[PDB]
Amino acid sequence: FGVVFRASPRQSDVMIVAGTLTNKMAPALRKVYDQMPEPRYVVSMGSCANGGGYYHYSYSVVRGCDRIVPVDIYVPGCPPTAEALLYGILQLQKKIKREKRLRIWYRR
Amino acid sequence: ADTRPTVRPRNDVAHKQLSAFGEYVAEILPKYVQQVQVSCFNELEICIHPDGVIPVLTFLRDHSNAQFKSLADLTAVDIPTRQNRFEIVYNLLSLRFNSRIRVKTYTDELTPIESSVPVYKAANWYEREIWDMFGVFFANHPDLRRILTDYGFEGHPFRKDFPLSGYVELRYDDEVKRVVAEPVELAQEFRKFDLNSPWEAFPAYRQPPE
Amino acid sequence: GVRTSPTGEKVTHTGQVYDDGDYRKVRFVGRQKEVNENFAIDLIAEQPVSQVGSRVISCDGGGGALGHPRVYINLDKETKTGTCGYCGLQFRQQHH
Amino acid sequence: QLITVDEKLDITTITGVPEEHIKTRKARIFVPARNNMQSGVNNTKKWKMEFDTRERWENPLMGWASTADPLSNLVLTFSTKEDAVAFAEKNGWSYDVEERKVPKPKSKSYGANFSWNKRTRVSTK
Amino acid sequence: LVSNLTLNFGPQHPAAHGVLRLVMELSGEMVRKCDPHIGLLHRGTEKLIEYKTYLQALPYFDRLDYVSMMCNEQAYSLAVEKLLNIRPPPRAQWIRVLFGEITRLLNHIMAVTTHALDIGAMTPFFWMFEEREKMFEFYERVSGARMHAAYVRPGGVHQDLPLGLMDDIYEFSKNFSLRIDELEEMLTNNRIWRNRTVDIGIVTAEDALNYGFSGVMLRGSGIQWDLRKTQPYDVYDQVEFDVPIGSRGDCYDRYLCRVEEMRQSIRIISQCLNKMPPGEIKVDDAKVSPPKRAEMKTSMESLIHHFKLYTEGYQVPPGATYTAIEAPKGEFGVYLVSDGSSRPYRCKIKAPGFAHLAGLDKMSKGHMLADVVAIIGTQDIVFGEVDR
Amino acid sequence: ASATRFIQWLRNWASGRDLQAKLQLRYQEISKRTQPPPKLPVGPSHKLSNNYYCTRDGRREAMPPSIVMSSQKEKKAVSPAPPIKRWELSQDEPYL
Amino acid sequence: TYKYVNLREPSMDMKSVTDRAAQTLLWTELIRGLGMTLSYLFREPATINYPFEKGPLSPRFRGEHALRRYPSGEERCIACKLCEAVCPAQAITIEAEPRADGSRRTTRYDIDMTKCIYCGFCQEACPVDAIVEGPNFEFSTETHEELLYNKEKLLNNGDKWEAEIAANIQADYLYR
Amino acid sequence: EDNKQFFGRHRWVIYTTEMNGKNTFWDVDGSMVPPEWHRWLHCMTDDP
Amino acid sequence: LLKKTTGLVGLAVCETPHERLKILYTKILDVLGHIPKNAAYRKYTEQITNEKLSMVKAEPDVKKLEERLQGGQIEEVILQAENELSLARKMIQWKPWEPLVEEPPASQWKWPI
Amino acid sequence: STSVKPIFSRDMNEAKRRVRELYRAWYREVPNTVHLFQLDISVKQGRDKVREMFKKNAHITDPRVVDLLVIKGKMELEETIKVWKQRTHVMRFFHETEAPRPKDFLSKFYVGHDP
Amino acid sequence: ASNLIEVFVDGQSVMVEPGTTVLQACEKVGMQIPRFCYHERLSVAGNCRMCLVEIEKAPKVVAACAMPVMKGWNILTNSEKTKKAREGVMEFLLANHPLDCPICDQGGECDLQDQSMMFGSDRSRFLEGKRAVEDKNIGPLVKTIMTRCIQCTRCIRFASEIAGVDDLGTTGRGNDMQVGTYIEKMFMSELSGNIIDICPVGALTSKPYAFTARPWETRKTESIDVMDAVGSNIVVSTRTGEVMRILPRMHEDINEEWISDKTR
C-alpha cells in the first residue's frame, strides 16, 4: 500500500500505538509525538491504548492514549487481528482523502 | 495411582523423602529453623527466623546433600493481620537431586532483611522488586532502588492497603506543555463484588473456634 | 412503537428521552440518536397463544440446546394464560 | 546488636498515602453482619476494616457511577479485633470499633410443639 | 567512564518485544557498565489478579509472554489444578502438549528471526512469519482468537478440537522441516552471522546457575537440564525427544539450540498427532469445570453449577504452591497462594526474562556496543513478562 | 503451483531442494471449511448409578500441610531425593 | 536424552583444509545463501489482495458484540447479570427492571469496547445465548465515544448480523 | 472463486460502484460485504 | 583417555582427580574437628565425607569412580568438595548448632489467617 | 518488646546527622537541576520546596522511621542527579495544574460533601 | 454446672446443657450442619431432612435439628454415611425444582444453590418431567413463584408463631402438597415482609426489589431504621451510589432479625 515497514520518528507520518501505555512510558511517547513533523496522525491499536483495556483499573497504566496525544483512528481488539489493523490504516487513508486544507485556506 | 479419573494421584514416596530431608535441615540448623512442613502435593517449606537467611541459604546451596544451586524465585507476601505483615519466600532448585525447597521468613515495615546476593546473584533484582512493591528494605544490597514503578512514585503498590488504582493519574496538559500528575478520578468506579459463599467449603481446613 | 417527544427526539424501548431543558441532547446535533426500531415488547405480543391439552407444558424456546433452559408451566388457572419466564410465549389449556 | 525504641509506632510518613486520605478518613472495624437471605455463617468469622462512603455521581456521557475516592473499594481482613486496631493506629486512621454480635444460644425442643397445657403447641405442620 | 550513553529504545523499531531503556558507560567502543531500566510495561498484573476469580485471572497469563500464550496458560492451570487436587483428562493433556509444542515453534520463530533482523538479516523474518501466520490459524480454529486463546484452563481445555484440525496440523508439520532448513541455509554456516554470534556473550555454567538462568541459557553452557525431562508435568513422559546441548556458551550455540528445539518440537508434534486419544476434554467434575451447554439447559444441578461457576467461581483449598514449566523462553513459574476463597490471595509470576535481563551487565562486559544488540536478542526478552 | 517447468527447474536448482514436493502455500490438501457435525463423548462420571460425588471429590481429599517440626510443639544422612540419573546420548542423531 | 549441537572436530587432512581454504577465499557458503534468496524471487508471493480477498476465519472467531433475539422477536437477554459478573475486564454494565408486561428485561446494557479483551467469557456464561461475539472485526472508529456501546447499538448489531451469527452458532454449538 | 489458487486467494469480491447512495468506484472498504456473504468470503463456511 | 572437555563452560579438566579430591576431603575432615562433637552438622558431614573418601581410595579408574560417586563429572565432584569445605569454615563462624535464637509470634505461620 | 533491629541510626542523634547531610546534597543540587532540566522556577522556589519537604516530616521521633525517610530521599536525589527522571517528574512537586483547594468550612460546604 | 453432659463431635469433646440438639452441639465446635427447614427463631420441623447426620455405632441417621444429644455420642458430621445422606436429600430437593436461576431474584444468595454446591452432587439422574405450581397473590409486597418452593414450611411457622397470623398453611397431600392460603387472601401484616428473608429459595421474593440487582454487586452499609423509635438495625444495600433495598441486621436485644414493612 506504500506503507514502509520501518520509519524513523522524524520522517514518520503516522504513529501507531500498539500496546499498553504505562505512566512511566507516557512522557517518552509525548516526546516522540512532538518530534514528529506535521502532518502527523496517531492510530490507537487495541484495548490498552484505546482506553486502558484490561489494566484500565491499574495504578501504573494510562487509561487510553488520548489522554496523552490526539488520536485519529481507534482500532478495537485485544489484539486486533492483522486484518483489523489493515482496515484501520485504510480508514486513515480515506480520512486523509477528505481533507480540505487548501479549500479552507482559499475561503479564509 | 488409583482408578479415580478426576482426582490427582498421591505420590507417597516423594512425601516420605521430603519429610526426611525436612528433619535433616532442622537437625543441622536448629538455631534458625522455626517450622518444617510438607504439603499434600509434595512441597517442602522451611520456616526460619529472619536472621538465619544467609546461614540457611548458604547451607542449602553448598552442602553436599543439598546443592540447591539455583534460586528459582524470591518474593514477598503481605498479610496485614500478622504483626510481621511481610513474609519473604525463597524458592530454590537442586539439579543434582532434582528437587525443590521453599524457605520462608518474615519482617515488618521497619525491620531490614539481610540481602541474599552474597549467596545468589539472582537475588539482586528480586530484592529491588520486593523493596519497590512491598517497601521491605534489604541491608547490604549493592544497589537498592525502584525497578518497576515510575520515578517519584509514592507508595508501595503490592501492599494490601494500597488502593488498586492508586492515588495519582497522568495526563498531558496543553498549558504547561508536559505530562502532569493529578488526583485520580475514574469515570466508572471499579465495582467491588462480594463473592464469598456463606457456607464452608473445606472442613479439613476448619479453624478452631475462638 | 417509536414515538417522538414534543421536542422531536425519538423515545427508546426503555422509555428514555432527553427532557426539554437537558443540555446533553447537544451530543446528537449534527449526528443521530441510535434507536433500535424493533421493540421486543410489541413483537412478543403479536405471537399467538398456544392451546394445549395438558395441565403442565414445557417450553425451551425452540431449537433444543439453542434455546433457553427448559421450564415447566402450569395452566390450571382459567382467568389467564401461562407465560414463559424466558421467551415470553403464552400457553392456554384447550377447551378446559 | 539491638536498640530500644519506645514511641508509638507510626508510619504515615513512609507509607506514601496523601494526607487528605489519612486524616479525614474514618475507618470502621467490625465483623460483617450475616446476610439474612441465607443461613450460612461462614462470612461472619473475620474482622473487616472499611472506610466511610464518599460521593459517587453519574458520568455525563454514559451514566456510569464516577468516584473521586481512592479508598472506596478497599477492605482489609483481620483475625482479631486487636489486629484491626493495631493496623489502623500505625497507619494513622481515625477508627471506630463495633463489638462482635454472637447469636444467643436458644432452647429448642420438638416435644414443645405438642403441649398439653402450654401455648407453644403448634396448630399445624 | 569515558561517556555515558543513555540508550532508550523509546522510538521503537520493528522488534515488538517491548521498550527498554538502557543506560551504558562506553569507554570507547567497549562497554564497561550496562544498566537496564524496566518499568515501561509494568501494568500491575499481580495486584489485579487478586481482584479476579481464578477463571477471570487466566487471560492475564496470555498477556505475559505474549509469544508463548498457551504455555503461560498451562503453567497457571497446572498450579491451580495442583491446589484443587484434580486431574485433567488424558485427551486434554495431549492437546496441551500438542499446543505447547505449536507454541514453542511460535516462540522460536520470533526469537531467531527478530534476533537476526536486529543484526541486519531481514529476509528470514518474512519467510517464517508466513508459517507463524498458519500457526495463528490453529489457535483461532480451536479458540476463536489468533493470539490470546484463553484455551488451556484448569481441568483441561475449553472446547474440543474441531473436526479436520489434526489433518491441517499434520500438513503444516509435514512441510515445516524444509522451512527450518532454508533458515539454516542463510545463517548456520554464514560467516557474517557467525562473526556476530560466535564467542559473544559467553556465560559459564557456574555463573548461569547462580544468576538464575534457565532454558537455553543453561543448555548453551552445557548444563543438562530440561523440566520436560526431569520434572514432567502432562504427557511429556510419553513422548521421545532429545534436548539440544551447547558446548561454548556463546550466542551461536544458543542460536543452534533454539533451531534444534524447533526440530524436536516437530518430532513431538508428530507423536501427539498419532497418539491423540479419545474422551472428554475437561475434568468431569462440575464443581470445577462448567457443564455442557446442553446439560445446563436440561439439568437443575448443571444449571446451579453453571450459575455459580461463572459468578462466584470454584473455591480453591487454602495452600501455596510453586509450579514451573519449561516455557519456550525458560522456566516459567507461578507462586500461587490460596486463602480458601474463590479469588487468589497472591499470584507471583516467575518470568525467565527477569533474571536473564538482570544478567545482561555480566554478559556485556568487554564487548562492543553493537554486540549488546546480539546479547539481548539471544536472551529472548519480552517485556510483558519482565515487568508483569 | 502454476509455475512453468523452466522456472520450476531454476528455483529447485538455486535452493538445492525439490521445492514442489513441500510447497509453502496451501491449495487443496487442506480440510474442508464445512465439516460434519460432531458427537463428542461423555466423561467417566456420566453414570446413572454407583456415581456418588463423595467418592470422586478431589477438592475435599486435600489436607492441610503436615508439620514435621515446630517450635511450639546414628541416623544416616539423606538427600532430598535420590541423585538424578545421567542422561544418555541420543542414538537417533548424537552429533548434530 | 540429549544431543550435541556444536561439538564437531574439523578434519586436518590437506583435502579438508583445502576445502575450507576454497570456502574462505571463494565465498562458497555466501553464494549458497544468495541461491536461496534467488529461489524465493521465483516463488509465488503469499500476499492476498485485501480488501478484495480476506484471511480465513472459523465459526469460533471472537469479534464485535451483539445482543440476539428469539425467532419470535423477543430479546433473549433476561438480565441475569452472569456476563457482567464473569467479565474479566469489567467491560459490561447492566441495569434491569420489570418491563411494562412484567418481563425480566434490561434497561441498560453497555459494553465499553475499549475495556473489553474480546475473550468471549460472556458468551460462555450466558444461559440463553443472548450475548455473542460476532464475526465482524472491521469496526474501527474515529472517536473514542463511538466505541462505548449502549443497548441500542448491541441490539442493532444483532439485527444487522443475525444471519451470519446464527449460522456460526449452528456450526459450533455442538462443540460448546 | 477459483479453486486452483492457493488458500486465501481462491475467493474474492469486486465491490459495487455505488452502495447506499455513496459513490464507491474508488472508495471501497471491507464493511461493504453483507453478512450472508461475509461468512463465505472469510471461509467460515464452504457453501455460498 | 584424559577428557578433552568437561562439557561445562568455565570448568576445566582435572589432570589429577584422585589426589585432588583426597586433599580436599581430608581437609574437610580436619576442619570438622573444630566443631562441637554433639552438633548435628559435624556428624552428618563427616559421614558423607568419609563414604566418598573411602570410594576415592578404592576406585582407581576415573570413569568408574564417577559412576560410584554419582556426582556428575569428576571435576564437578571436586567443585562440590570445595563448596563443602568453604561451607564448614563458614559454619564455625555462624554456629547453627545453638538452640533456637527466637520463636515466632503466636500466629506467624498460620494459614489461612 | 521495644528491642528492635536498626536500619542505620541507633538513636535520633545519628538519624538527625544523616538528615542534615541529605539536606546538604539537596541544597547544592537545586542550582544544577534548575539548569539541566531547564525548569521555569527560580532556584529560590526550588530550595523552598526542599525546605518544605523536610519540614513536613518534623514531628518524627522514631530512629527507624527517620532512616527510611532518609533512604527514600537519597533515592530521589540519585534519580535527579543522574537525570533518570525527566522534566515532568521534577515538576510534579509543584502541582501547577491543580486548582486552589479551599480549607475553610464555608468554602468546602459550598462545593461538595467532602469533609 | 453439673447439668452439662459430655458429647463428642468427630472426637472433639464439648459440654452441653441437656436438651440441646445435635445441630446445636455441632455449632459449639464451630461447624454448621446443612439445613432448609430449621430456623433458630421458629419451632423445630424436622421435615427437609438435610440435617441428617451419623452417630457412631448407630445404624440410622438422625435429624440433627430435632434430636436431643445423649451422653457419649460421637457425631460424625463428615463420614461417608453422612455425606451420602446429604447427597441423596439434595437430589430429591432438586428433582422438581425449576431451572429458574437466571430469572430468579434469589440467584447468587440462595441456600439451595450454595448447599447444592457444597453438599450435593455435580450432576442429575432425573429423567422425568417436573412439577409445576400455580402462583398465589398474597399481597402487593411479597411476590410468589411457588414452583420454586421446597416445602420447608418456614413461612407457615413464622406467620403462626411470630406474626400471629394463621393465613398460611399447606393444602393437599404428597407431591401435590402446596403452600398458600387456599382462598384469595393477602398476608398483609406489619411483619409480612419477613417471610421473604426466611424463605430459603426464590419462592417468596420482594416485589419492589424484583429484577433490579444481584447480591454480588451490592455494597452493604450497616445503619439504623428511623421509621420508628425501636431503632431496628438494618443493612442498606447500594449499587453504583443508589439505594437498592433494606435488609434486617441481627440485633438480639432490639429487633432480633426482623423488621417492619415500613422499614423494609
Ligand code: SF4
Ligand atoms: S493484545 Fe490486548 S492486552 Fe496485549 S497490548 Fe494489545 S490490547 Fe493490550
Ligand code: SF4
Ligand atoms: S469478551 Fe470477555 S472482556 Fe469482552 S465483554 Fe465479553 S467477557 Fe467481558
Ligand code: SF4
Ligand atoms: S446477556 Fe446473557 S448472561 Fe448477560 S444478563 Fe443477559 S441473559 Fe444474563
Ligand code: SF4
Ligand atoms: S430458588 Fe435458588 S436454586 Fe431455585 S431457581 Fe432460585 S436461585 Fe435457582
Ligand code: SF4
Ligand atoms: S414458600 Fe419458601 S419458606 Fe414457605 S415452605 Fe416454600 S420454600 Fe419454605
Ligand code: FES
Ligand atoms: S433442618 Fe433438620 S430436617 Fe430440616
Ligand SMILES: [K+]
Ligand atoms: K426468599
Ligand SMILES: [Zn+2]
Ligand atoms: Zn420459553
